[PDB]
């Protein structure tokens, strides 16, 4: 099966540089033109750059010309995007994608890697309880972290039913915040233990927060 596996994304400084990689398998890589396409958070898809099969021809969007360089190493089955002079507006999920050799359209996309461009430092989240007071609701507020992402699980994965982990919001401070909630039998509140397991890998934060009724 055809696969395109992306890597090299993460948090970087304005004016800084970053290199993305796209590892191709399951087809003769050197026979096809390749592309990078970006999706800024919550917005549309924007084509970034393209390269011929041999690497002899390269193409760029106006918004990245002179700063980004597309390249490939056919002996490694790898496509590259060298992003120099980065700006906040370059913040996006970046996709590598293959061009159809016969018909010309993009026919296969990689899963994408998040690139965040900001002067702000990595920051682990504070995790606060959302205490419960038929059906009861409880959760965890995961506040003031940077960059994305975090993961949340309940009771080390044992509790999944009725769980809603919300998309993070970006606050004016420039830090993210999300809630994760679960609805449970209100009779279970006294006997059953509820713990939210929060991971923020960029800051190596691991927090297990027990959520209890407050009196």
């Amino acid at each position: 099966e055809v696969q395109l596996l992306e890597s090299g994304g993460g948090l970087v400084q304005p004016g800084g540089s970053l290199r993305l990689s796209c590892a191709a398998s399951g087809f003769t890589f050197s026979s096809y033109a390749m592309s990078w396409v970006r999706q800024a958070p919550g917005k549309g898809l924007e084509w970034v750059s393209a390269i011929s099969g041999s690497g002899g021809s390269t193409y760029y969007a106006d918004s990245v010309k002179g700063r980004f360089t597309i390249s490939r190493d056919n002996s490694k089955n790898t496509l590259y995007l060298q992003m120099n002079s980065l700006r906040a507006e370059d913040t996006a999920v970046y996709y590598c994608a293959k061009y159809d050799g016969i018909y010309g359209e993009l026919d296969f996309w990689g899963q994408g890697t998040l690139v965040t461009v900001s002067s702000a430092s990595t920051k682990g989240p504070s995790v606060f309880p959302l205490a419960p007071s038929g059906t009861a609701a409880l959760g965890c507020l995961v506040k003031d972290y940077f960059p994305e992402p975090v993961t949340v699980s309940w009771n080390s994965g044992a509790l999944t039913s009725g769980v809603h982990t919300f998309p993070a919001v970006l606050q004016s401070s420039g830090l993210y915040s999300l809630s994760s909630v679960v609805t449970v039998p209100s009779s279970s509140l006294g006997t059953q233990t509820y713990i939210c397991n929060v991971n923020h890998k960029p800051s190596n934060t691991k927090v297990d927060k027990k959520v209890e009724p407050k009196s």
Partner: protein
């Protein structure tokens, strides 16, 4: 560049029903070089249609495309559960290639009112000089709902943020989290913290509240 406008922004339909999506170009698309992509949340785009009307290999019969010049159509004759996703059109006849803003095809189900819960800020957070108040609207349809914050009957503005989950795979509902952010000093100045919810599934608005400093 060629601008692609898709309509409608959202389509609410039931499984088994017909879906018709429109993609209008600001200039004539060359040689019907227009593609349609499917994208599910957190996933890479998947090619459905190339050349305005040609099904990609592996794409089921139910998907078809038509059109020329400036007006293009994607048709899904009979919606399967897995067909509910975002759909983009894309022109590649004139560089740079460009994408429409996408049409979301959502499951239409019976009107369900939200279960509303309010959460006070924890004692732990209050030590940091900030108070976050959270309002949960659980398992509702349709997606539109209105949340008003009231602090001792005073309407709040400019100090809350919302996020909504993706449509639930089991019951087809949405959930919404709203967070009111106050300095501790402002939080301490008032008693009644209230979240007022307006929704189609409610005959009149639903208020959930608590008083600061009362078990």
């Amino acid at each position: 560049e060629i601008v692609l406008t898709q309509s409608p922004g959202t389509l609410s339909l039931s499984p088994g029903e017909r879906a018709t999506l429109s993609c209008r170009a600001s200039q004539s698309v060359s040689s019907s070089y227009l593609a349609w992509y499917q994208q599910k949340p957190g996933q890479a785009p998947r090619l459905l249609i190339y050349g305005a009307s040609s099904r990609a290999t592996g794409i089921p019969d139910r998907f078809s495309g038509s059109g020329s010049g400036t007006d293009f159509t994607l048709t899904i004759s009979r919606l399967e559960p897995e067909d509910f996703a975002v759909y983009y059109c894309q022109q590649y006849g004139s560089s740079p290639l460009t994408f429409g803003q996408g049409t979301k095809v959502e499951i239409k189900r019976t009107v369900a009112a939200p279960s509303v819960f309010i959460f006070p800020p924890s004692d732990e957070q209050l030590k940091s000089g900030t108070a976050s108040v959270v309002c949960l609207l659980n398992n509702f349809y349709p997606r539109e709902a209105k949340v008003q914050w009231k602090v001792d009957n005073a309407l709040q503005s400019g100090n809350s943020q919302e996020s909504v989950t993706e449509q639930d795979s089991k019951d087809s509902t949405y959930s919404l989290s709203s967070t009111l952010t106050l300095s501790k000093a402002d939080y301490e100045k008032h008693k009644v913290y209230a979240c007022e919810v307006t929704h189609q599934g409610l005959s009149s608005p639903v208020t959930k509240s608590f008083n600061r400093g009362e078990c």
